[PDB]
Amino acid sequence: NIPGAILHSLAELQDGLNAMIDPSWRAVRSLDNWALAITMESTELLDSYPWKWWKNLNATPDLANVRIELVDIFHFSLSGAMQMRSTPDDEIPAASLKPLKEVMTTFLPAKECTSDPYGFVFFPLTDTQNAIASFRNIIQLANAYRFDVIIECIIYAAEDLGFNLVAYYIAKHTLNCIRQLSGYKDGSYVKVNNGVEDNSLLHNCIKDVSLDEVLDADKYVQAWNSIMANVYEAFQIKESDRKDAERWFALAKENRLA
Amino acid sequence: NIPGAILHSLAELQDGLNAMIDPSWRAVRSLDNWALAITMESTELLDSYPWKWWKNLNATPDLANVRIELVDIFHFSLSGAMQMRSTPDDEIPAASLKPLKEVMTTFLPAKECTSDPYGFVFFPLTDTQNAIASFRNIIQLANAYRFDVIIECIIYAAEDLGFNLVAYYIAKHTLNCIRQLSGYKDGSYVKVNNGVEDNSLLHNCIKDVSLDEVLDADKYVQAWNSIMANVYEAFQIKESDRKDAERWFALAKENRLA
Numbered sequence: 483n484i485p486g487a488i489l490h491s492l493a494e495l496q497d498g499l500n501a502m503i504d505p506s507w508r509a510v511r512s513l514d515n516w517a518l519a520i521t522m523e524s525t526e527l528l529d530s531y532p533w534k535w536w537k538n539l540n541a542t543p544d545l546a547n548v549r550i551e552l553v554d555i556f557h558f559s560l561s562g563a564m565q566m567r568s569t570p571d572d573e574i575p576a577a578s579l580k581p582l583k584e585v586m587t588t589f590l591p592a593k594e595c596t597s598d599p600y601g602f603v604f605f606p607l608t609d610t611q612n613a614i615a616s617f618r619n620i621i622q623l624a625n626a627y628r629f630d631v632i633i634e635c636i637i638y639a640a641e642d643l644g645f646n647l648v649a650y651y652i653a654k655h656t657l658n659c660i661r662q663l664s665g666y667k668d669g670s671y672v673k674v675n676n677g678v679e680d681n682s683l684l685h686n687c688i689k690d691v692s693l694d695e696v697l698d699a700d701k702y703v704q705a706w707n708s709i710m711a712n713v714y715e716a717f718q719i720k721e722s723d724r725k726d727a728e729r730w731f732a733l734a735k736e737n738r739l740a
Numbered sequence: 741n742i743p744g745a746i747l748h749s750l751a752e753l754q755d756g757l758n759a760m761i762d763p764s765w766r767a768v769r770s771l772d773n774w775a776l777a778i779t780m781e782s783t784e785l786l787d788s789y790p791w792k793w794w795k796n797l798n799a800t801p802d803l804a805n806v807r808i809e810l811v812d813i814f815h816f817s818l819s820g821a822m823q824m825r826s827t828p829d830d831e832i833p834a835a836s837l838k839p840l841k842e843v844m845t846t847f848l849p850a851k852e853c854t855s856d857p858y859g860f861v862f863f864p865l866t867d868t869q870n871a872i873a874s875f876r877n878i879i880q881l882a883n884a885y886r887f888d889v890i891i892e893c894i895i896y897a898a899e900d901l902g903f904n905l906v907a908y909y910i911a912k913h914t915l916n917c918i919r920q921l922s923g924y925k926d927g928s929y930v931k932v933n934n935g936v937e938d939n940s941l942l943h944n945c946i947k948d949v950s951l952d953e954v955l956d957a958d959k960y961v962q963a964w965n966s967i968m969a970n971v972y973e974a975f976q977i978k979e980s981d982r983k984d985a986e987r988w989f990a991l992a993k994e995n996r997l998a
């Protein structure tokens with residue numbers, strides 16, 4: 483699916499973004515933090531579907547929002563997977579080393595369907611019962627600190643919903659940087675300006691990116707850079723405040739030296 | 741704490757409200773529905789706290805909102821506990837009969853604190869790390885269909901936050917009816933009118949209710965009725981669309997006859 487070399491590079495963008503929020507984020511963040519953050523995005527994702535039997539019956543799933551929620555879970559999962567790697571063996575939580583069947587019960591839709599290879603996520607994800615069981619499962623995987631499994635699920639989820647996971651990751655990665663530049667930590671960012679959520683600008687930024695461009699070993703940097711520029715442009719961001727992919731790769735090599 | 745007779749009566753209000761949403765709700769709702777609904781309120785509750793390390797740092801917990809989220813979890817827990825009772829023994833999920841330690845791992849704050857008797861919820865709940873571990877636990881209890889335990893936790897939570905759980909239940913119960921009368925199912929309710937969430941009107945409706953009034957065997961009906969009237973009044977609801985407690989108790993006795 484997505485190549486190991488590209489996955490490495492995504493981890494480096496993630497690391498740089500986390501460093502932008504806190505310079506020694508591995509030292510200050512816990513495994514529980516990333517699990518919580520996945521839990522919170524999983525319910526954001528579920529609220530995209532007409533799951534409520536007492537409100538707004540026959541609403542359509544907001545699949546466009548589901549794309550971004552997936553990518554949000556991705557961010558936090560890459561982060562947890564690399565917090566895990568950086569945790570000393572004697573600080574590894576027992577729930578992540580117990581057998582999987584022993585730390586979760588798997589939810590299953592009532593109706594027949596296909597799933598990912600682990601059988602944790604169910605397709606089509608256009609179906610709300612499939613999504614419910616999928617993300618109730620993802621929350622449990624997050625509780626058992628199974629970040630690498632979650633990453634695999636997301637990737638299978640994006641295959642099924644038929645969008646470019648990596649392209650959207652790059653777009654939202656860029657937006658996350660922008661929020662950090664524009665007062666997200668203090669009370670001052672306007673996330674919904676004129677009634678439009680910042681996330682909803684991202685879709686137009688990934689229209690000309692192919693699945694090939696974004697995963698190709700000789701094409702990807704360039705492809706990522708043109709997505710990043712689109713998002714910075716879409717938010718009228720100064721050139722001096724933009725970073726490109728190599729700036730991220732460079733911050734990554736340098737700043738794994740404590 | 742809250743008396744068994746009062747608890748019975750709360751279940752009857754719940755049953756009437758559920759019947760208002762769907763007349764044979766025990767037949768159509770599943771145990772998973774109520775667990776999901778608890779999961780979604782638990783994250784609503786957590787978003788009341790400054791848990792994010794990358795956004796709005798040093799925000800205060802919105803404890804006022806936490807009160808209502810607790811009550812929302814209460815609604816759904818009473819509902820699940822009574823779906824459980826109505827489930828034939830041969831349809832009871834295995835995760836609700838397995839030993840508790842076997843279907844969940846308990847999250848614990850880092851710092852020293854007090855807890856409920858089960859050790860699932862941690863005090864003071866003014867502390868965000870206590871709330872996080874508490875409600876990550878509640879989600880797991882919901883997954884194992886432990887609705888009666890959740891009800892016990894909520895009750896201990898409201899003791900700690902120092903508000904009247906039952907008074908707020910009656911207020912929100914009344915609001916839930918109102919939303920059903922005013923187009924919640926179709927696209928047409930305005931939940932946030934002029935920038936104020938409907939839930940935020942409830943606080944002024946419970947100012948003159950004592951802990952005694954609301955739990956007293958000879959005082960409670962009257963006390964509940966005056967809370968209900970306050971909420972209907974606060975939402976300018978026609979007298980003809982209001983119900984009182986005995987109307988709920990009467991719908992309950994009659995409509996446990998299939």
Ligand SMILES: O=c1ccn([C@H]2C[C@H](O)[C@@H](COP(=O)(O)NP(=O)(O)O)O2)c(=O)[nH]1
Nearest residue numbers: 499500503553554557558654658681794795
């Ligand atoms: O240390 C962090 C903290 C946050 N995020 C990002 C990931 C995710 O894409 C975004 C979620 O931000 P939010 O405040 O939950 N807002 P929304 O869910 O609408 O994007 O925050 C990180 O990547 N690393």
Ligand SMILES: O=c1ccn([C@H]2C[C@H](O)[C@@H](COP(=O)(O)NP(=O)(O)O)O2)c(=O)[nH]1
Nearest residue numbers: 536537757758761811812815816912916939
């Ligand atoms: O069958 C149902 C469906 C909903 N609710 C109520 C309980 C809860 O108090 C409320 C939650 O409604 P919501 O749509 O999640 N909105 P909010 O969380 O802001 O109250 O819905 C019931 O009591 N029974």
Ligand SMILES: [Mg+2]
Nearest residue numbers: 522523526554
């Ligand atoms: Mg979020």
Ligand SMILES: [Mg+2]
Nearest residue numbers: 526527547551
């Ligand atoms: Mg969202």
Ligand SMILES: [Mg+2]
Nearest residue numbers: 523526551554
């Ligand atoms: Mg999100």
Ligand SMILES: [Mg+2]
Nearest residue numbers: 780781784812
């Ligand atoms: Mg809700």
Ligand SMILES: [Mg+2]
Nearest residue numbers: 784785805809
């Ligand atoms: Mg809420």
Ligand SMILES: [Mg+2]
Nearest residue numbers: 781784809812
């Ligand atoms: Mg709520």
